[PDB]
């Protein structure tokens, strides 16, 4: 299960002729779903696994960070702007961007400063991820584990292969939920926890079909 030919699939039981040949099951998350044939070249299929996992690790950081400012605002923490698609504009606020609610914290005012600091900092650590840097030079491009597994969880390679599947399946859900958050903000206009609260309030009317006539071209 999750590896070899005798693994889980993307159509489940109705998937014995659905999966292609090259999707054997030696990589994590391989349920055999390449319906459009994009990953037929193993050189490109190597590139798309890096594109999938880095997207997964940014979406898991995304989907946790698009949610915890709005939970703590329901617990009574004042942020200025707690909704994630409004939380970028709070650096133009009158007191700037305090971190949770404390002006003793970050208290940023200049957006060009915090962006240029980001370009220097993220330009180095994304460069460390490619060629190597202070935490390692010749490791796995996706799973370094020398300085990036301090708790020793990259041991016992049988259960470590399970952790790679637990990584991508949590990650694919977060990518599927970040694609959520983007569309449930464009369509609704409210926060995703606010999208959760009124669907738990009335599941009958507060769904996506109540907003289906929003994008009608009326001319």
């Amino acid at each position: 299960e999750f590896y070899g030919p005798n693994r889980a699939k993307w159509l489940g039981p109705y998937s014995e002729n659905a999966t292609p040949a090259y999707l054997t099951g030696e990589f994590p998350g391989d349920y055999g779903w390449d319906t459009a044939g994009l990953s037929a070249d193993p050189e490109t299929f190597k590139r798309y696994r890096e594109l999938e996992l880095i997207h997964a690790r940014w979406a898991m950081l995304g989907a946790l960070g698009c949610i915890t400012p709005e939970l703590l605002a329901k617990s009574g923490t004042q942020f200025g702007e707690a909704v994630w698609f409004k939380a970028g504009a709070q650096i133009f606020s009158e007191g700037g961007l305090d971190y949770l609610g404390n002006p003793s914290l970050v208290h940023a005012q200049n957006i060009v400063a915090t962006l240029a600091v980001q370009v220097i900092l993220m330009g180095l650590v994304e460069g460390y991820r490619v060629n190597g840097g202070p935490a390692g030079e010749g490791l796995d491009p996706l799973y370094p584990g020398e300085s990036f597994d301090p708790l020793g969880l990259a041991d016992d390679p049988d259960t470590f292969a399970e952790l790679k599947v637990k990584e991508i399946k949590n990650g694919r859900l977060a990518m599927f939920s970040m694609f959520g958050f983007f569309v449930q903000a464009i369509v609704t206009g409210k926060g995703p926890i606010q999208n959760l609260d009124d669907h738990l309030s009335n599941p009958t009317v507060n769904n996506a079909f109540a907003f289906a006539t929003k994008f009608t071209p009326s001319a």
């Binding site: 180095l124 190597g132 202070p134 030079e137 010749g138």
Partner: peptide, 12 residues
């Protein structure tokens, strides 16, 4: 351990 340079090449 293998310690690539902080900004560029070989460091340590």
């Amino acid at each position: 351990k293998a310690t690539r340079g902080w900004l560029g090449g070989q460091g340590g």
